[PDB]
Amino acid sequence: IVGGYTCGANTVPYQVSLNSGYHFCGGSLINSQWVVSAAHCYKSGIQVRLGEDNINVVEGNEQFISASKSIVHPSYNSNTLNNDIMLIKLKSAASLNSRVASISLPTSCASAGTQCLISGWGNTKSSGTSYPDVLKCLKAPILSDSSCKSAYPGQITSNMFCAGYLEGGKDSCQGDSGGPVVCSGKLQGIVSWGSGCAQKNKPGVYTKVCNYVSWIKQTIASN
Ligand SMILES: [Ca+2]
Secondary structure (H helix, E strand, O other): OEOOEEOOOOOOOOEEEEEOOOEEEEEEEEEOOEEEEOHHHOOOOOEEEEOOOOOOOOOOOOEEEEEEEEEEOOOOEOOOOEOOOEEEEEOOOOOOEOOEOOOEOOOOOOOOOOEEEEEEOOOOOOOOOOOOOOOEEEEEEEOOHHHHHHHOOOOOOOOEEEEOOOOOOOEOOOOOOOOEEEEOOEEEEEEEEOOOOOEOOEOEEEEEHHHHHHHHHHHHHHO
């Protein structure tokens, strides 16, 4: 997250870190056994880390649970990043509490102008490189479909939306991939892609989660 703030320990209790010897992506806990992330975060050997603030220090609220299975969306295209969504099942159910909690799926899509919370352990620099170890947060509005498409000619599908600031300065970044965009207590987006970070007229692009609720529910119901 570039131009954000330190969230505070366990203030984003649905935020997970995906770890394969190191943090490589964010995710969102949606029930005791399932995490939603980006399809471009897919790999084998995933451990899901819940209750994290400092990802380099065991602070006492963590739960480390290995993934038993991953399910990339059937229509995911890695070239265009269309349908950039994946489900990860935990080998055991997480113990839910005030600091490890599921985030509700949307019942309807959120509109341009809706204020949301984007969070992650990604790069905090738009030019250089600096990885924070504590969770960073950004309050950002959803942008209009028209402004999103104008920012990225030929690249915005019906399964994507832009959020952030056309002036730049505040954005998601490398390492935030797969993490949450939460608006009015609902998971509306997944950190998916952008062109650099916090650049003028290049806001972050997010997977439009409301399009996938039926797939998420049906997949969970049979796996
Ligand atoms: Ca920790």
